[PDB]
Design a protein around this ligand. Structure first.
Ligand SMILES: Fc1ccc(-c2cnc3nnc(C(F)(F)c4ccc5ncccc5c4)n3n2)cc1
Length: 288
């Protein structure tokens, strides 16, 4: 760590959490990604109050350049701030399990597992509401010209107030369910990817809009896997033939129309996230 560029160390200073401010419970894994396990922790603010944290210990870092890019990404990630986007609380360098990524604890876990849980009954309105929250988080990310590239219900989280946070980006980027990825060394979430992305491996905000349409379909089916009867390797031709996900039984017509628009073959014809927020707000307001 003494081998790092000192100016980079100074640049990341405001992101760093000292070990005397952090308690991590390393004996119980609360989440698993390909690139690291997550543990519960408590972070002490300057008032002495406790903030519950998810602390992720990154594996497979081998060289200073990777460490340097880790720090660089921590810096930009710290600058993101929106109620529907997962925040970076900080990183802990002087610890066992270093480097540690310190994120807010998400009481209700990932959105996909949440809606699949049979013991609760979110209403159609609640489910549309989760989609609206995701649209607002994406509207923010897109306004900063950030492209997520892996938007899906599995990659959004829910906190104790049922606020949805777009997650799985920056230092929190991972594969959290390897079943849905095919491996440039590119790991591709094929069934969420826009047609042009499948063909060229290029990604844009409009390809995020495509993924958002699939996410809406996930919400309306309460977490069904998309295209269950289509093999991963066959999705591209499926789409080129003029086929799309079918309308879920309890998906209102205007929302299925929104989904269809998100999957338009021409990227420029897809709605913006600002348009999605406005239209989905209207649809949401018609329930109950
Ligand atoms: F089964 C699954 C499926 C997905 C995820 C998932 C998805 N996106 C993420 N972005 N960051 C994280 C994370 F691992 F850092 C995290 C952040 C807060 C948590 N709060 C409480 C408990 C686990 C937490 C994990 N994820 N995780 C985790 C499990």
């Amino acid at each position: 760590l003494s081998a790092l560029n000192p100016e980079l160390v100074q640049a990341v200073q405001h992101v760093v959490i000292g070990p005397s401010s952090l308690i991590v419970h390393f004996n119980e894994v609360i989440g698993r990604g390909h690139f690291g396990c997550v543990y519960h922790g408590t972070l002490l603010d300057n008032d002495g109050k406790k903030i519950h944290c998810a602390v992720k210990s990154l594996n497979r870092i081998t060289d200073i350049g990777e460490v340097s890019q880790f720090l660089t990404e921590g810096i930009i990630m710290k600058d993101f701030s929106h109620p529907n986007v997962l925040s970076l609380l900080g990183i802990c360098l002087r610890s066992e399990g270093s480097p540690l990524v310190v994120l807010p604890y998400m009481k209700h876990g990932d959105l996909r597992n949440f809606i699949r849980n049979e013991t609760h009954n979110p209403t159609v309105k609640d489910l549309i509401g989760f989609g609206l929250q995701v649209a607002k988080g994406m509207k923010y990310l897109a306004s900063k010209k950030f492209v997520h590239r892996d938007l899906a219900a599995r990659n959004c989280m829910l906190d104790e107030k049922f606020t949805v946070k777009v997650a799985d980006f920056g230092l929190a980027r991972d594969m959290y369910d390897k079943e849905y990825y095919s491996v440039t060394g590119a790991k591709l979430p094929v069934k969420w990817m826009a047609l042009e992305s499948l063909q060229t491996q290029k990604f844009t905000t409009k390809s995020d809009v495509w993924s958002f349409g699939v996410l809406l379909w996930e919400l309306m089916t309460r977490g069904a896997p998309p295209y269950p009867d289509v093999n991963t390797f066959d999705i591209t031709v499926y789409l080129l033939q003029g086929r799309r996900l079918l309308q879920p039984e309890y998906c209102p017509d205007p929302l299925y129309e929104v989904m269809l628009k998100c999957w338009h073959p021409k990227a420029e014809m897809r709605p913006s996230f600002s348009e999605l927020v406005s239209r989905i707000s209207a649809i949401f307001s018609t329930f109950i």
